[PDB]
Design a protein around this ligand. Structure first.
Ligand code: HEM
Ligand SMILES: N[C@@H]1C[C@H]1c1ccccc1
Length: 427
Protein backbone atom coordinates (compact mmCIF):
# COMPACT_ATOMS: atom_id res chain seq x y z
CA UNK A 1 0.00 0.00 0.00
CA UNK A 2 1.48 3.31 -1.25
CA UNK A 3 0.50 6.95 -0.60
CA UNK A 4 -1.46 6.96 -3.89
CA UNK A 5 -3.73 4.18 -2.57
CA UNK A 6 -4.59 6.46 0.36
CA UNK A 7 -5.38 9.23 -2.07
CA UNK A 8 -7.67 6.86 -3.94
CA UNK A 9 -9.66 6.01 -0.76
CA UNK A 10 -10.14 9.75 -0.15
CA UNK A 11 -11.05 10.53 -3.79
CA UNK A 12 -13.69 7.82 -3.48
CA UNK A 13 -14.97 8.86 -0.04
CA UNK A 14 -14.68 12.66 -0.19
CA UNK A 15 -15.28 13.45 -3.84
CA UNK A 16 -13.68 15.13 -6.86
CA UNK A 17 -11.82 17.87 -4.92
CA UNK A 18 -9.77 16.91 -1.79
CA UNK A 19 -7.10 18.75 0.22
CA UNK A 20 -4.16 16.48 0.95
CA UNK A 21 -0.58 16.52 2.13
CA UNK A 22 1.93 15.25 -0.45
CA UNK A 23 5.75 15.49 -0.26
CA UNK A 24 5.01 17.26 3.06
CA UNK A 25 3.21 20.10 1.21
CA UNK A 26 -0.48 21.09 1.00
CA UNK A 27 -2.26 20.36 -2.28
CA UNK A 28 -5.73 19.67 -3.66
CA UNK A 29 -6.22 16.33 -5.52
CA UNK A 30 -8.66 16.85 -8.39
CA UNK A 31 -10.22 13.68 -9.90
CA UNK A 32 -13.03 14.64 -12.28
CA UNK A 33 -12.32 14.17 -16.01
CA UNK A 34 -13.65 17.69 -16.65
CA UNK A 35 -10.96 19.18 -14.37
CA UNK A 36 -8.22 17.06 -15.95
CA UNK A 37 -9.29 18.44 -19.32
CA UNK A 38 -9.45 22.04 -18.01
CA UNK A 39 -6.07 22.26 -16.33
CA UNK A 40 -3.78 19.97 -18.35
CA UNK A 41 -5.14 20.82 -21.84
CA UNK A 42 -4.39 24.57 -21.57
CA UNK A 43 -0.99 26.35 -21.55
CA UNK A 44 -2.52 28.82 -19.06
CA UNK A 45 -1.69 26.35 -16.28
CA UNK A 46 1.87 25.46 -15.54
CA UNK A 47 3.79 23.24 -13.16
CA UNK A 48 4.09 24.19 -9.51
CA UNK A 49 7.66 25.19 -8.71
CA UNK A 50 7.05 24.32 -5.05
CA UNK A 51 6.26 20.69 -5.84
CA UNK A 52 9.29 20.13 -8.12
CA UNK A 53 12.01 21.61 -5.88
CA UNK A 54 12.48 18.04 -4.68
CA UNK A 55 13.86 17.07 -8.11
CA UNK A 56 15.67 20.37 -8.77
CA UNK A 57 18.10 19.90 -5.85
CA UNK A 58 18.57 17.01 -3.42
CA UNK A 59 20.19 17.19 0.05
CA UNK A 60 21.99 20.35 -1.04
CA UNK A 61 23.13 19.06 -4.43
CA UNK A 62 21.83 20.23 -7.80
CA UNK A 63 20.21 17.26 -9.62
CA UNK A 64 17.56 17.92 -12.31
CA UNK A 65 18.09 21.66 -11.71
CA UNK A 66 16.07 23.57 -14.30
CA UNK A 67 16.03 20.78 -16.87
CA UNK A 68 13.09 19.83 -19.08
CA UNK A 69 11.09 18.03 -16.33
CA UNK A 70 11.73 20.42 -13.46
CA UNK A 71 11.48 23.80 -15.25
CA UNK A 72 8.06 25.28 -14.46
CA UNK A 73 8.13 28.74 -16.02
CA UNK A 74 6.36 28.47 -19.38
CA UNK A 75 8.44 30.66 -21.74
CA UNK A 76 11.69 29.16 -20.38
CA UNK A 77 10.52 25.53 -20.70
CA UNK A 78 9.06 26.36 -24.13
CA UNK A 79 12.54 27.49 -25.26
CA UNK A 80 14.12 24.09 -24.45
CA UNK A 81 11.13 21.98 -25.56
CA UNK A 82 10.98 23.45 -29.11
CA UNK A 83 14.70 22.72 -29.62
CA UNK A 84 14.77 19.28 -27.95
CA UNK A 85 11.61 18.31 -29.89
CA UNK A 86 13.65 17.83 -33.07
CA UNK A 87 15.42 14.83 -31.48
CA UNK A 88 11.99 13.16 -31.29
CA UNK A 89 10.79 13.45 -34.90
CA UNK A 90 9.30 10.37 -36.57
CA UNK A 91 12.54 10.06 -38.57
CA UNK A 92 14.71 10.41 -35.43
CA UNK A 93 12.90 7.56 -33.65
CA UNK A 94 13.03 5.32 -36.73
CA UNK A 95 16.82 5.67 -36.61
CA UNK A 96 16.86 4.19 -33.08
CA UNK A 97 15.22 0.87 -34.01
CA UNK A 98 18.74 -0.51 -34.26
CA UNK A 99 19.62 0.44 -30.67
CA UNK A 100 16.32 -1.00 -29.37
CA UNK A 101 16.80 -4.26 -31.31
CA UNK A 102 20.41 -4.68 -30.23
CA UNK A 103 19.81 -4.18 -26.50
CA UNK A 104 16.64 -6.24 -26.56
CA UNK A 105 18.49 -9.10 -28.26
CA UNK A 106 21.38 -8.88 -25.87
CA UNK A 107 18.87 -9.00 -22.97
CA UNK A 108 17.21 -12.13 -24.29
CA UNK A 109 20.46 -14.13 -24.81
CA UNK A 110 21.65 -13.36 -21.28
CA UNK A 111 18.27 -14.61 -20.07
CA UNK A 112 18.36 -17.62 -22.41
CA UNK A 113 21.75 -18.50 -20.82
CA UNK A 114 19.98 -18.68 -17.42
CA UNK A 115 16.87 -20.46 -18.74
CA UNK A 116 17.16 -23.76 -16.84
CA UNK A 117 14.06 -23.22 -14.70
CA UNK A 118 15.73 -23.07 -11.32
CA UNK A 119 18.03 -20.02 -11.64
CA UNK A 120 16.41 -16.99 -9.93
CA UNK A 121 16.72 -13.84 -12.00
CA UNK A 122 15.57 -10.39 -10.93
CA UNK A 123 13.61 -9.14 -13.92
CA UNK A 124 13.47 -5.71 -12.30
CA UNK A 125 17.28 -5.42 -12.37
CA UNK A 126 17.56 -7.07 -15.81
CA UNK A 127 14.98 -4.62 -17.27
CA UNK A 128 16.72 -1.71 -15.56
CA UNK A 129 20.10 -2.50 -17.22
CA UNK A 130 18.36 -2.88 -20.60
CA UNK A 131 16.55 0.49 -20.31
CA UNK A 132 19.71 2.22 -19.20
CA UNK A 133 21.82 0.55 -21.93
CA UNK A 134 19.18 1.71 -24.53
CA UNK A 135 18.93 5.27 -23.28
CA UNK A 136 22.72 5.82 -22.98
CA UNK A 137 23.43 4.73 -26.57
CA UNK A 138 20.29 6.21 -28.14
CA UNK A 139 20.45 9.59 -26.34
CA UNK A 140 24.18 10.12 -25.73
CA UNK A 141 26.11 7.81 -28.12
CA UNK A 142 27.68 5.96 -25.21
CA UNK A 143 27.78 2.29 -24.26
CA UNK A 144 27.23 1.58 -20.57
CA UNK A 145 27.01 -2.18 -21.13
CA UNK A 146 25.22 -2.80 -17.81
CA UNK A 147 23.72 -5.92 -19.34
CA UNK A 148 27.30 -7.19 -19.56
CA UNK A 149 28.21 -6.54 -15.91
CA UNK A 150 29.78 -3.15 -16.51
CA UNK A 151 29.43 0.28 -14.84
CA UNK A 152 28.59 -1.05 -11.35
CA UNK A 153 29.35 2.30 -9.61
CA UNK A 154 27.12 4.26 -12.04
CA UNK A 155 24.36 1.73 -11.41
CA UNK A 156 24.81 2.08 -7.62
CA UNK A 157 24.83 5.90 -8.05
CA UNK A 158 21.37 5.89 -9.71
CA UNK A 159 20.03 3.57 -7.00
CA UNK A 160 21.17 5.89 -4.19
CA UNK A 161 20.08 9.05 -6.03
CA UNK A 162 16.47 7.76 -6.38
CA UNK A 163 16.42 6.82 -2.68
CA UNK A 164 17.60 10.39 -2.11
CA UNK A 165 14.66 11.89 -4.01
CA UNK A 166 12.32 9.68 -1.97
CA UNK A 167 13.58 10.51 1.54
CA UNK A 168 13.77 14.19 0.58
CA UNK A 169 10.03 14.10 -0.26
CA UNK A 170 9.12 12.00 2.81
CA UNK A 171 10.93 13.63 5.79
CA UNK A 172 21.30 8.89 8.63
CA UNK A 173 24.80 10.52 8.32
CA UNK A 174 26.21 8.02 5.74
CA UNK A 175 23.26 7.69 3.29
CA UNK A 176 23.19 11.49 3.35
CA UNK A 177 26.77 11.73 2.03
CA UNK A 178 26.36 8.77 -0.34
CA UNK A 179 23.38 10.47 -1.99
CA UNK A 180 25.42 13.68 -2.40
CA UNK A 181 28.34 11.58 -3.70
CA UNK A 182 26.04 9.76 -6.12
CA UNK A 183 24.53 12.97 -7.51
CA UNK A 184 27.97 14.52 -8.04
CA UNK A 185 29.18 11.29 -9.69
CA UNK A 186 26.16 11.48 -12.02
CA UNK A 187 26.68 15.07 -13.16
CA UNK A 188 30.41 14.19 -13.56
CA UNK A 189 29.62 11.35 -16.00
CA UNK A 190 27.63 14.11 -17.74
CA UNK A 191 30.52 16.52 -18.23
CA UNK A 192 32.81 13.68 -19.38
CA UNK A 193 30.25 12.50 -21.98
CA UNK A 194 29.74 16.12 -22.98
CA UNK A 195 33.55 16.52 -23.11
CA UNK A 196 33.72 13.43 -25.37
CA UNK A 197 31.10 14.79 -27.81
CA UNK A 198 32.74 18.24 -28.15
CA UNK A 199 36.22 16.78 -28.66
CA UNK A 200 34.86 14.46 -31.37
CA UNK A 201 33.29 17.43 -33.14
CA UNK A 202 36.59 19.38 -32.78
CA UNK A 203 38.34 16.64 -34.78
CA UNK A 204 35.63 17.09 -37.43
CA UNK A 205 33.86 13.76 -36.92
CA UNK A 206 30.41 13.03 -38.37
CA UNK A 207 28.23 12.45 -35.29
CA UNK A 208 24.67 11.33 -36.12
CA UNK A 209 22.17 13.75 -34.54
CA UNK A 210 20.59 12.60 -31.26
CA UNK A 211 19.19 13.93 -27.95
CA UNK A 212 22.56 15.20 -26.75
CA UNK A 213 22.83 17.14 -30.01
CA UNK A 214 19.65 19.03 -29.17
CA UNK A 215 20.46 19.55 -25.47
CA UNK A 216 23.83 21.11 -26.39
CA UNK A 217 22.06 23.25 -29.00
CA UNK A 218 19.52 24.43 -26.43
CA UNK A 219 22.38 25.81 -24.31
CA UNK A 220 24.15 28.14 -26.82
CA UNK A 221 24.76 31.38 -24.87
CA UNK A 222 25.58 29.73 -21.56
CA UNK A 223 28.15 31.11 -19.10
CA UNK A 224 28.59 27.53 -17.91
CA UNK A 225 27.58 23.94 -18.64
CA UNK A 226 25.09 23.76 -15.71
CA UNK A 227 21.91 23.98 -17.83
CA UNK A 228 23.24 21.33 -20.19
CA UNK A 229 24.13 19.09 -17.23
CA UNK A 230 20.60 19.66 -15.82
CA UNK A 231 19.26 18.33 -19.11
CA UNK A 232 21.87 15.55 -19.14
CA UNK A 233 20.79 14.20 -15.73
CA UNK A 234 17.10 14.79 -16.67
CA UNK A 235 17.35 12.57 -19.73
CA UNK A 236 19.60 9.96 -18.17
CA UNK A 237 17.02 9.33 -15.42
CA UNK A 238 13.70 10.18 -17.05
CA UNK A 239 14.77 8.25 -20.17
CA UNK A 240 15.27 4.89 -18.50
CA UNK A 241 13.65 4.73 -15.04
CA UNK A 242 9.95 4.82 -15.91
CA UNK A 243 10.53 2.63 -18.99
CA UNK A 244 12.19 -0.04 -16.80
CA UNK A 245 9.45 0.33 -14.17
CA UNK A 246 6.72 -0.10 -16.90
CA UNK A 247 8.47 -3.20 -18.21
CA UNK A 248 8.93 -4.67 -14.73
CA UNK A 249 5.24 -4.21 -13.90
CA UNK A 250 4.15 -5.77 -17.24
CA UNK A 251 6.37 -8.84 -16.76
CA UNK A 252 5.17 -9.22 -13.15
CA UNK A 253 1.50 -8.98 -14.12
CA UNK A 254 1.79 -11.29 -17.13
CA UNK A 255 3.25 -14.04 -14.93
CA UNK A 256 -0.22 -14.57 -13.42
CA UNK A 257 -2.08 -14.08 -16.73
CA UNK A 258 -1.61 -17.28 -18.76
CA UNK A 259 -4.51 -16.75 -21.25
CA UNK A 260 -3.25 -13.23 -22.04
CA UNK A 261 0.26 -14.63 -22.60
CA UNK A 262 -1.09 -17.14 -25.18
CA UNK A 263 -2.79 -14.33 -27.12
CA UNK A 264 0.45 -12.33 -26.97
CA UNK A 265 2.49 -15.36 -28.14
CA UNK A 266 -0.07 -16.05 -30.90
CA UNK A 267 0.22 -12.41 -32.07
CA UNK A 268 4.04 -12.34 -31.98
CA UNK A 269 4.08 -15.48 -34.14
CA UNK A 270 1.85 -13.89 -36.87
CA UNK A 271 3.47 -10.44 -37.29
CA UNK A 272 7.21 -11.02 -36.66
CA UNK A 273 7.47 -14.84 -36.55
CA UNK A 274 10.88 -16.11 -35.46
CA UNK A 275 12.39 -13.02 -37.13
CA UNK A 276 15.35 -11.57 -35.21
CA UNK A 277 15.13 -7.89 -36.14
CA UNK A 278 11.92 -5.88 -35.67
CA UNK A 279 11.32 -3.22 -38.36
CA UNK A 280 9.59 0.09 -37.53
CA UNK A 281 6.52 -1.17 -39.42
CA UNK A 282 6.38 -4.34 -37.28
CA UNK A 283 5.55 -2.26 -34.12
CA UNK A 284 2.26 -0.86 -35.42
CA UNK A 285 0.87 -4.33 -36.14
CA UNK A 286 1.49 -5.60 -32.60
CA UNK A 287 -1.98 -4.39 -31.55
CA UNK A 288 -2.90 -6.82 -28.71
CA UNK A 289 0.55 -6.14 -27.14
CA UNK A 290 -0.22 -2.44 -27.42
CA UNK A 291 -3.50 -3.03 -25.52
CA UNK A 292 -1.67 -5.04 -22.79
CA UNK A 293 0.96 -2.30 -22.29
CA UNK A 294 -1.83 0.30 -22.12
CA UNK A 295 -3.65 -1.79 -19.50
CA UNK A 296 -0.39 -2.22 -17.54
CA UNK A 297 -0.11 1.60 -17.50
CA UNK A 298 -3.62 2.05 -16.17
CA UNK A 299 -3.09 -0.13 -13.10
CA UNK A 300 0.63 0.50 -12.73
CA UNK A 301 1.68 3.96 -14.00
CA UNK A 302 5.32 4.53 -12.91
CA UNK A 303 4.80 8.26 -12.92
CA UNK A 304 1.48 8.59 -11.09
CA UNK A 305 0.77 12.16 -12.17
CA UNK A 306 1.53 15.84 -12.10
CA UNK A 307 0.97 19.21 -10.41
CA UNK A 308 -0.40 22.45 -11.78
CA UNK A 309 -0.16 25.73 -9.81
CA UNK A 310 -3.60 27.32 -9.49
CA UNK A 311 -2.77 31.07 -9.34
CA UNK A 312 -6.22 32.41 -8.37
CA UNK A 313 -9.08 31.22 -6.14
CA UNK A 314 -11.36 29.23 -8.44
CA UNK A 315 -14.50 27.06 -8.40
CA UNK A 316 -13.57 23.42 -9.03
CA UNK A 317 -16.58 21.06 -9.18
CA UNK A 318 -18.63 23.26 -6.88
CA UNK A 319 -15.61 23.58 -4.55
CA UNK A 320 -13.91 26.90 -3.83
CA UNK A 321 -10.16 26.34 -3.96
CA UNK A 322 -7.93 29.16 -2.63
CA UNK A 323 -5.36 30.80 -4.91
CA UNK A 324 -1.71 29.84 -5.00
CA UNK A 325 -2.70 26.18 -4.42
CA UNK A 326 -0.89 23.20 -6.07
CA UNK A 327 -3.35 20.94 -7.91
CA UNK A 328 -2.52 17.23 -7.92
CA UNK A 329 -3.75 15.06 -10.85
CA UNK A 330 -3.32 11.31 -10.43
CA UNK A 331 -3.69 8.76 -13.27
CA UNK A 332 -3.05 6.10 -10.69
CA UNK A 333 -6.14 7.20 -8.70
CA UNK A 334 -8.49 7.63 -11.65
CA UNK A 335 -7.47 4.28 -13.13
CA UNK A 336 -8.64 2.60 -9.97
CA UNK A 337 -12.01 4.39 -9.59
CA UNK A 338 -15.04 2.23 -10.48
CA UNK A 339 -16.68 5.48 -11.47
CA UNK A 340 -14.40 5.47 -14.57
CA UNK A 341 -13.41 1.83 -15.00
CA UNK A 342 -15.66 -1.15 -14.59
CA UNK A 343 -14.12 -3.79 -12.29
CA UNK A 344 -11.00 -1.58 -11.84
CA UNK A 345 -8.70 -4.17 -10.21
CA UNK A 346 -9.23 -6.58 -13.12
CA UNK A 347 -6.34 -6.53 -15.61
CA UNK A 348 -8.27 -6.53 -18.88
CA UNK A 349 -6.52 -5.52 -22.11
CA UNK A 350 -9.93 -5.71 -23.88
CA UNK A 351 -10.58 -2.27 -22.33
CA UNK A 352 -8.34 -0.89 -25.04
CA UNK A 353 -9.78 -3.12 -27.82
CA UNK A 354 -10.43 -1.73 -31.30
CA UNK A 355 -13.91 -0.19 -31.11
CA UNK A 356 -13.97 0.65 -27.39
CA UNK A 357 -14.36 4.38 -26.68
CA UNK A 358 -10.95 5.78 -25.65
CA UNK A 359 -10.86 6.93 -22.00
CA UNK A 360 -11.80 10.61 -21.82
CA UNK A 361 -9.40 12.33 -19.44
CA UNK A 362 -9.40 9.43 -17.01
CA UNK A 363 -6.07 7.94 -18.11
CA UNK A 364 -2.83 9.79 -18.58
CA UNK A 365 0.28 7.70 -17.87
CA UNK A 366 2.31 10.09 -20.06
CA UNK A 367 0.32 13.07 -18.79
CA UNK A 368 -1.48 15.39 -21.21
CA UNK A 369 -1.21 18.78 -22.98
CA UNK A 370 2.01 20.80 -23.34
CA UNK A 371 3.80 19.24 -20.38
CA UNK A 372 3.17 15.69 -21.63
CA UNK A 373 6.01 13.15 -21.96
CA UNK A 374 8.36 14.17 -24.78
CA UNK A 375 9.52 10.55 -24.66
CA UNK A 376 6.14 8.85 -25.19
CA UNK A 377 6.73 7.46 -28.69
CA UNK A 378 10.35 6.68 -27.75
CA UNK A 379 9.12 4.71 -24.67
CA UNK A 380 6.27 2.95 -26.44
CA UNK A 381 8.66 1.85 -29.24
CA UNK A 382 11.42 0.54 -26.99
CA UNK A 383 9.05 -1.36 -24.64
CA UNK A 384 7.24 -3.02 -27.56
CA UNK A 385 10.62 -4.14 -28.94
CA UNK A 386 11.69 -5.50 -25.52
CA UNK A 387 8.40 -7.33 -24.86
CA UNK A 388 8.11 -8.72 -28.39
CA UNK A 389 11.53 -10.33 -28.03
CA UNK A 390 10.76 -11.84 -24.63
CA UNK A 391 7.41 -13.17 -25.87
CA UNK A 392 9.19 -14.86 -28.80
CA UNK A 393 11.83 -16.72 -26.85
CA UNK A 394 11.06 -17.07 -23.15
CA UNK A 395 8.56 -18.07 -20.51
CA UNK A 396 8.75 -16.76 -16.94
CA UNK A 397 7.56 -18.17 -13.67
CA UNK A 398 7.44 -15.92 -10.64
CA UNK A 399 9.53 -17.40 -7.77
CA UNK A 400 7.24 -18.40 -4.85
CA UNK A 401 7.14 -15.61 -2.25
CA UNK A 402 7.39 -12.87 -4.86
CA UNK A 403 4.72 -10.27 -4.09
CA UNK A 404 2.59 -8.19 -6.44
CA UNK A 405 2.44 -4.91 -4.49
CA UNK A 406 4.00 -1.53 -5.25
CA UNK A 407 6.46 0.87 -3.71
CA UNK A 408 7.02 4.55 -4.30
CA UNK A 409 10.57 5.76 -4.72
CA UNK A 410 10.93 8.63 -7.18
CA UNK A 411 8.37 6.63 -9.21
CA UNK A 412 6.07 3.63 -8.66
CA UNK A 413 7.76 0.23 -9.22
CA UNK A 414 7.25 -3.33 -7.93
CA UNK A 415 7.82 -3.85 -4.19
CA UNK A 416 9.59 -7.16 -4.89
CA UNK A 417 12.34 -7.36 -7.54
CA UNK A 418 10.24 -9.61 -9.83
CA UNK A 419 12.30 -12.75 -9.21
CA UNK A 420 11.62 -15.27 -11.93
CA UNK A 421 12.88 -18.58 -13.19
CA UNK A 422 13.02 -18.94 -16.96
CA UNK A 423 12.64 -21.52 -19.73
CA UNK A 424 12.95 -21.24 -23.52
CA UNK A 425 9.51 -20.84 -25.12
CA UNK A 426 8.45 -24.47 -25.66
CA UNK A 427 11.05 -25.99 -23.26
C1 HEM B 1 6.86 4.15 -20.16
C2 HEM B 1 7.83 5.28 -20.02
C3 HEM B 1 7.51 6.54 -19.72
C4 HEM B 1 6.43 7.09 -18.89
C5 HEM B 1 5.49 6.22 -18.07
C6 HEM B 1 6.72 8.39 -18.73
C7 HEM B 1 5.80 9.35 -18.05
C8 HEM B 1 5.88 10.69 -18.21
C9 HEM B 1 5.03 11.65 -17.45
C10 HEM B 1 3.75 11.29 -16.70
C11 HEM B 1 5.54 12.87 -17.58
C12 HEM B 1 5.15 14.16 -16.89
C13 HEM B 1 5.94 14.23 -15.57
C14 HEM B 1 5.53 15.44 -14.71
O1 HEM B 1 4.43 16.11 -14.93
O2 HEM B 1 6.24 15.79 -13.77
C15 HEM B 1 6.84 12.71 -18.30
C16 HEM B 1 7.81 13.82 -18.52
C17 HEM B 1 8.85 13.67 -19.33
N1 HEM B 1 9.44 12.53 -19.73
FE1 HEM B 1 8.65 10.67 -19.60
N2 HEM B 1 7.88 8.76 -19.36
C18 HEM B 1 8.27 7.72 -20.12
C19 HEM B 1 9.37 7.57 -20.84
C20 HEM B 1 10.27 8.64 -21.25
C21 HEM B 1 11.45 8.46 -21.87
C22 HEM B 1 11.88 7.23 -22.68
C23 HEM B 1 11.88 9.85 -22.10
C24 HEM B 1 13.11 10.27 -22.87
C25 HEM B 1 13.55 9.52 -23.87
C26 HEM B 1 11.17 10.60 -21.24
C27 HEM B 1 11.36 12.07 -21.13
C28 HEM B 1 10.52 12.87 -20.48
C29 HEM B 1 10.95 14.18 -19.96
C30 HEM B 1 12.19 14.88 -20.42
C31 HEM B 1 9.83 14.76 -19.51
C32 HEM B 1 9.52 16.25 -19.47
C33 HEM B 1 8.50 16.66 -20.52
C34 HEM B 1 8.28 18.17 -20.54
O3 HEM B 1 7.57 18.73 -19.73
O4 HEM B 1 8.84 18.92 -21.47
N3 HEM B 1 10.08 9.92 -20.87
N4 HEM B 1 6.93 11.34 -18.74
N1 LIG C 1 10.04 10.59 -17.84
C1 LIG C 1 9.56 10.26 -16.50
C2 LIG C 1 8.55 10.93 -15.62
C3 LIG C 1 10.01 11.23 -15.46
C4 LIG C 1 10.80 11.03 -14.23
C5 LIG C 1 11.43 9.84 -13.88
C6 LIG C 1 12.21 9.76 -12.71
C7 LIG C 1 12.40 10.89 -11.90
C8 LIG C 1 11.80 12.09 -12.28
C9 LIG C 1 11.01 12.15 -13.43
Amino acid sequence: RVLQDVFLDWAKKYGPVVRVNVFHKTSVIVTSPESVKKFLMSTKYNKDSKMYRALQTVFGERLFGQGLVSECNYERWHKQRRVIDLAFSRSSLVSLMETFNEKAEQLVEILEAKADGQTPVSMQDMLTYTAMDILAKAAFGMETSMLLGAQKPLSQAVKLMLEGITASRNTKRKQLREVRESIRFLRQVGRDWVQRRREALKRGEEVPADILTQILKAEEGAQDDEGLLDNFVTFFIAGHETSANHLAFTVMELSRQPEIVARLQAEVDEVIGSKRYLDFEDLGRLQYLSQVLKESLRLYPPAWGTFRLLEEETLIDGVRVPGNTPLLFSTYVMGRMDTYFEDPLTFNPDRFGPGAPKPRFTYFPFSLGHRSCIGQQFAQMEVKVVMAKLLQRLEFRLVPGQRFGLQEQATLKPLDPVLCTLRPRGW
